[PDB]
A paper describes a structure:
First, using cryo-EM, we analyzed the structure of the MOR(DAMGO)-Gi-scFv16 complex in the BMS-986122 bound state, at 3.1 Å resolution. Additionally, we observed density on the membrane-facing surface on TM3, 4, and 5 of MOR, only for the map of the MOR(DAMGO)-Gi-scFv16 complex obtained in the BMS-986122 bound state, indicating that this density corresponds to BMS-986122 bound to MOR. The position of this additional density is consistent with our previous result that the substitution of T1623.45 on TM3 to a methionine abrogated the binding of BMS-98612219, supporting the notion that the aforementioned additional density originates from BMS-986122 bound to MOR. However, due to the relatively weak EM density at this allosteric site, as well as the moderate resolution of 3.1 Å, it was not possible to unambiguously model BMS-986122 solely by the cryo-EM data. We then docked BMS-986122 in the cryo-EM structure so that the methoxybenzyl bromide moiety is adjacent to M2455.49. In the structure, the aromatic residues W1583.41 on TM3, and F180ICL2 in the intracellular loop 2 (ICL2), contact the aromatic rings of BMS-986122. The side chains of these residues were modeled closer to each other in the cryo-EM structure of MOR(DAMGO)-Gi-scFv16 in the BMS-986122 bound state than in the BMS-986122 unbound state, as evidenced by a connecting density between these residues, which was observed in the cryo-EM map of the BMS-986122 bound state but not in the unbound state (red circles). In contrast, in the cryo-EM structure of the MOR(DAMGO)-Gi-scFv16 complex in the BMS-986122 bound state, the side chain atoms of R1673.50 and Y2545.58 fill the space formed by the outward shift of the intracellular half of TM6. BMS-986122 binds to the outer surface in the transmembrane region on TM3, TM4, and TM5 and does not interact directly with the side chain atoms of R1673.50 or Y2545.58, which reside in the inner core region of MOR.
Numbering used by the authors:
A (entry chain H): 1 to 121, 135 to 248
B (entry chain S): 1 to 5
C (entry chain R): 66 to 347
D (entry chain B): 2 to 340
E (entry chain A): 5 to 55, 182 to 354
F (entry chain G): 5 to 63
The structure:
């Protein structure tokens, strides 16, 4: 049973410091490239930091480099994010995310429960979901769209586009990896397609639990970037 | 060795 | 007069050419065939490399004696002096460390299982390289070009008291490059032979005894070649530094033959180890 | 003298069978193919060397995507390679290092191995845990495991030095069908393309065709003079070659029940370790103790080419399902990809 | 180039590093192949060196980690799997001295001692074991002293013309076994007269293995 | 003895079955193999190598 439990959140004055922790159990923590992703209260997902298996590679988002430090303690199966000079714009839910990378793997396949942080009072690829909400009725069929400012198709043949579903009150869940691959455990009524720059997620016979926000994400190059999200409302 | 001087 | 210089330059050229040829063939064979997989291959590689670098300096010496003047400038004078001292010290210390490795292999096999990894061989090579730099650098700085009586001299200038510093350098070279290396090689190889004399694979059969005899003969040949090739130049240096011996044409021929003998060790190094190597004959 | 009357009756049945085979030997494959063009210049090159094993390699198996492959070596490691990049995808540590065989499930979800431990271990490559786990240890053979092939994710066929073959239910771990009748060590087996039949090669110098679902021997093929080390189905399932210590490869047609052609050269005297067909069946690739792989014209028996890139016995080889490449594995601890 | 393959190439190197570090341990291992006819004293030797095909045991002595493999029950052709043990450090061949006088079975071809001698001939001369040291444990010496008092060695060796003393019979048997080595100059046999109580036998195998290590290092260092 | 008699009748049962199988002519058997090779020669990349742009191990 895979578990990731973040802790350390709370209320902090601006300019202060705070260390978040992510506690891993139920899997081979060491061999998993961890990722911190944050979500502002009424906003979309924003990638924060990445530390590879073995700690050989670390990447930060531009808005956080210099201020945040990501680390891991493999013997105790714990991930850390040491934050300093906290600003009001850092107030968000922080998700711990596991991601293993090898031929045919499914990155971003498990997200933590999230911890809440409250701070008192260019070259990056832009992901565009032009449709902010969509009204739907059960049994019908939906098509969500996403576009990239650059081609996501690589010379190796892969197109590095991911689809996530965030149900209300829960952590995001991987649906599609590399545009067309169906994630493990997700019902076959979801399917993804596209070509190069424009992409489409199609749901067949939409059910009740399918309601939520759908984010697209590019993994062609760092920093990883999400779309604004498309909401599915009941009629 | 020894050369130069 | 001219005959003596002709013979001196002929010996210089022969030594240089055979040293370069043998060392480069050893380098090619080592890089192609052996693969840097055994610890002994790393040592042979470094020995051949430093030996060819040492041999590279000979024709500069030959032309310096022939013309009696140095035209290649102060930069090249510094480079030549530093590279010569560097390569001499590195070749000698590589010989010493190879002998110590063999002694540890034969007399401490259980420890040799752990201590004789190729990574440790490369570490020891790097340490030897650095410790030779620790004396090459001061010689590099002190190397200047001074106007001699005839045309020019590429020599070393020492701060006053210059006699004190020159004597200290000569004594340090003689000790740390001849006496202690000879002692280390002799002691290690003697202990190795004493331990080999009491092994079950060589005691009891004519063939076995013959193999032991040939191992001892190869060890003794290496040690004798090193002693014979490095002793005369050092004793000549010490006798000239201690006694103001009058200059004669015989003095010049003897001195140049002593230098050629000091570089004959370099020339014979590959024969001694690469060529005689049983593994090499595969 | 009951044993006498039976031993003499078997000789009469052998003569009947020999005569029936002679009766339908109206021609030879060799004379049938004189008219067709030779294959000509087969100039194969090494495109990849897979480095990282530290002992002899005895087996490998291509995945069905023609890109991943698994190799098994006595260093106790099962390595899965991405042959396109040479990246190692997984390195699986074996409980027993005395492995002789490995296999890739056609689904790609599982690998298998085993050897002198007499156990066929099944490994789950797609765990939630993120690592590879032993999912089953198939116990019951009484000699070394010489070969194994998945039928699907729940069924696998094994060959053993105990002279038997077996069909296993992986879920329950039980031997559900046994295949007895060989009188010597079974060295190799090959699944028919439709997986309804398999052939086995044994140290009795015979090959046997087995019906998987009925659990009995349909046909028996003799002709080799020594050990059969290797066997491979013709791609259409109507024939199969037989690598043997006699430095010969004798393709046997099932329906005609006899040898059609032998592939040998006077200057090849070493054993054969492995055989495989190209996608069209035109090329027969064979690995030799003399460190080389020979490429034979399967229709005309002429040697078409040589793969000489190893410094020790070639122990295994395989051709991708798409036919694009052949891999060779060697006691020298390297694999090479050729095309 | 290398968009997400960068994390894949990093993983390949991270597991390529653990293969290297696990192969360094294995290269220090002393690999021992235990052979001998059933009841020759093999499992007793295992007990002495201590506190389903290939039964295995490992133990430490004088800071050397030994790995011993007992082929055990293996009903198959040796020639098909024996080459797997090419490269073992040493073979330990156990011989039951007291088996020399065992009566032939119902259809037994030769006596127990002669079948053991035949096994030794095949192993010592095996092409895969040309450069392998053979250590011979002549075991069950205690029973031999009781049997030799009443049963002459000529039952086993009709050509034996010596006396039925321990010393003459033991020396003759040892010679008979060692004479089977057709490559004495390239291969050396280490013969020990162990028993059920003998404790220096582990030391004997340690001493024999140390000489083998010396030969390998001399071979590697170019001196051989 | 009791094991040699059980194996001896197993050999008779097996030989009886093998004698009764349907066999075709070698000439027909050889023709079928030739027909397969010719029909699939174009899809065999080892027989007729493809350009480097179609070759995964050179791309
Ligand atoms: C000033 O004198 C000397 C000082 C050092 C050395 C060499 S170079 C670095 C290693 N040493 S070593 O101690 O001999 C040595 C050799 C082999 C091994 Cl495995 C371990 C140690 C040589 C000399 Br002449």
């Amino acid at each position: 049973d895979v578990q990731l439990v973040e802790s350390g959140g709370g209320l902090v004055q601006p300019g202060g410091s705070r260390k978040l922790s992510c506690s891993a159990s139920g899997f081979a923590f060491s061999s998993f490239g961890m990722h911190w992703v944050r979500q502002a209260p009424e906003k979309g997902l924003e990638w924060v930091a990445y530390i590879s298996s073995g700690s050989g590679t670390i990447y930060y988002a531009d808005t956080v480099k210099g201020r945040f430090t990501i680390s891991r303690d493999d013997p105790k199966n714990t991930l850390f994010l040491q934050m300093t000079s906290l600003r009001s714009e850092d107030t968000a839910m922080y998700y711990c995310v596991r991601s293993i990378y090898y031929y045919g793997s499914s990155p971003f396949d498990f997200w933590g429960q999230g911890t809440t942080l409250t701070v008192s009072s260019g070259s990056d690829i832009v992901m565009t979901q032009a449709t902010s909400s969509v009204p739907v009725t059960p049994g019908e069929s939906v098509s969500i769209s996403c576009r990239s400012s650059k081609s996501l198709l690589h010379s190796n043949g892969n197109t590095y586009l991911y689809w996530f579903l965030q149900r209300p009150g829960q952590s995001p869940q991987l649906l599609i990896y590399r545009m067309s691959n169906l994630a493990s455990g997700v019902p076959d009524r979801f399917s993804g397609s596209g070509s190069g720059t424009a992409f489409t997620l199609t749901i067949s016979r939409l059910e009740a639990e399918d309601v939520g926000v759908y984010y697209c994400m590019q993994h062609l190059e760092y920093p990883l970037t999400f779309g604004a999200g498309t909401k599915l409302e009941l009629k | 060795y020894x050369g130069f001087x | 007069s001219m005959i003596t210089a002709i013979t001196i330059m002929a010996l210089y050229s022969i030594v240089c050419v055979v040293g370069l040829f043998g060392n480069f063939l050893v380098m090619y064979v080592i890089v192609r065939y052996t693969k840097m997989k055994t610890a002994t291959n790393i040592y042979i590689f470094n020995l051949a490399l430093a030996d060819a670098l040492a041999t590279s300096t000979l024709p500069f010496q030959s032309v310096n004696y022939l013309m009696g003047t140095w035209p290649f400038g102060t930069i090249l004078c510094k480079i030549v002096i530093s590279i010569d001292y560097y390569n001499m010290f590195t070749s000698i210390w590589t010989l010493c460390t190879m002998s110590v490795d063999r002694y540890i292999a034969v007399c401490h096999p259980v420890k040799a299982l752990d201590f004789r990894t190729p990574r440790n061989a490369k570490i020891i090579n790097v340490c030897n390289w650095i410790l030779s730099s620790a004396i090459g650098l001061p010689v590099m700085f002190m190397a200047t070009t001074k106007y001699r009586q005839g045309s020019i001299d590429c020599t070393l200038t020492f701060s006053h008291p210059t006699w004190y510093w020159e004597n200290l350098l000569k004594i340090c070279v003689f000790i740390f490059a001849f006496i202690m290396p000879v002692l280390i090689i002799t002691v290690c190889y003697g202990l190795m032979i004493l331990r080999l004399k009491s092994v079950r694979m060589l005691s009891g059969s004519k063939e076995k005894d013959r193999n032991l005899r040939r191992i001892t003969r190869m060890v003794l040949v290496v040690v004798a070649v090193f002693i014979v090739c490095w002793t005369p130049i050092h004793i000549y240096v010490i006798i000239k530094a201690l006694v103001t011996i009058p200059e004669t044409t015989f003095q010049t021929v003897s001195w140049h033959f002593c230098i050629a003998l000091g570089y004959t060790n370099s020339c014979l190094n590959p024969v001694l180890y690469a060529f005689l190597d049983e593994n090499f004959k595969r | 003298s009951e044993l006498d009357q039976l031993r003499q009756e078997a000789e009469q049945l052998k003569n009947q069978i020999r005569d029936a085979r002679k009766a339908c030997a109206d021609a030879t494959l060799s004379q049938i193919t004189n008219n067709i063009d030779p294959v000509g210049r087969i100039q194969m090159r090494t495109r990849r060397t897979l480095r990282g094993h530290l002992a002899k390699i005895y087996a490998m198996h291509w995945g069905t995507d023609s890109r991943l492959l698994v190799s098994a070596s006595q260093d106790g490691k099962l390595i899965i390679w991405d042959s396109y990049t040479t990246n190692k995808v997984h390195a699986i540590p074996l409980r027993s290092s005395w492995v002789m065989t490995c296999a890739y499930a056609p689904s790609g979800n599982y690998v298998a191995c085993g050897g002198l431990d007499n156990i066929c271990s099944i490994y789950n490559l797609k765990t939630r845990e993120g690592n590879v786990r032993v999912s089953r240890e198939l116990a019951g053979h009484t000699g070394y495991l010489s070969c194994c092939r998945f039928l699907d994710d729940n069924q696998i066929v094994t060959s053993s030095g105990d002279t038997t073959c077996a069909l296993w239910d992986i879920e329950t771990g039980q031997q559900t069908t046994t295949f007895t009748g060989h009188t010597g060590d079974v060295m190799s087996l090959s699944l028919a393309p439709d997986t309804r039949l398999f052939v086995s090669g044994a140290c009795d110098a015979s090959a046997k065709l087995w019906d998987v679902r009925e659990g009995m021997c349909r046909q028996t093929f003799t002709g080799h003079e020594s050990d059969i080390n290797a066997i491979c189905f013709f791609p259409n399932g109507n024939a199969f070659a037989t690598g043997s210590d006699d430095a010969t490869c004798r393709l046997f047609d099932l329906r005609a029940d006899q040898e059609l052609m032998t592939y040998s050269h006077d200057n090849i005297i070493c054993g054969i370790t492995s055989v495989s067909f190209s996608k069209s069946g035109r090329l027969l690739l064979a690995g030799y103790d003399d460190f080389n792989c020979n490429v034979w014209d399967a229709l005309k028996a002429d040697r078409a080419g040589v793969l000489a890139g190893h410094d020790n016995r070639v122990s295994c080889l395989g051709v991708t399902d798409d036919g694009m490449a052949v891999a060779t594995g060697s006691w020298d601890s390297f694999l090479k990809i050729w095309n | 180039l290398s968009a997400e393959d960068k994390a894949a190439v990093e993983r390949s190197k991270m597991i390529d590093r653990n293969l290297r570090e696990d192969g360094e341990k294995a290269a220090k291992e002393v690999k021992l192949l235990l052979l001998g006819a059933g009841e020759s004293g093999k499992s007793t030797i295992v007990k002495q060196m201590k506190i389903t095909g290939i039964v295995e045991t490992h133990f430490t002595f004088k800071d050397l980690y030994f790995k011993m493999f007992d082929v055990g029950g293996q009903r198959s052709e040796r020639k098909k799997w024996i080459h797997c043990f090419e490269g073992v450090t040493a073979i330990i061949f156990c011989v039951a001295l007291s088996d020399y006088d065992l009566v032939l079975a119902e259809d037994e071809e030769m006596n127990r001692m002669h079948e053991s001698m035949k096994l030794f001939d095949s192993i010592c001369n095996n092409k895969w074991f040309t450069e392998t040291s053979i250590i011979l444990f002549l075991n069950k010496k205690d029973l031999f002293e009781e049997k030799i008092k009443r049963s002459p060695l000529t039952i086993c060796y009709p050509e034996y013309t010596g006396s039925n003393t321990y010393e003459e019979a033991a020396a003759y048997i040892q010679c008979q076994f060692e004479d089977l080595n057709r490559r004495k100059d390239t291969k050396e046999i280490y013969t020990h007269f162990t028993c059920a109580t003998d404790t220096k036998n582990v030391q004997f195998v340690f001493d024999a293995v140390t000489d083998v290590i010396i030969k390998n290092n001399l071979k590697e260092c170019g001196l051989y | 003895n009791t094991a040699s008699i059980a194996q001896a009748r197993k050999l008779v049962e097996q030989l009886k079955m093998e004698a009764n199988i349907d066999r075709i002519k070698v000439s027909k058997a050889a023709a079928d193999l030739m027909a397969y090779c010719e029909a699939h020669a174009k899809e065999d990349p080892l027989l007729t190598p493809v350009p480097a742009s179609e070759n995964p191990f050179r791309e």
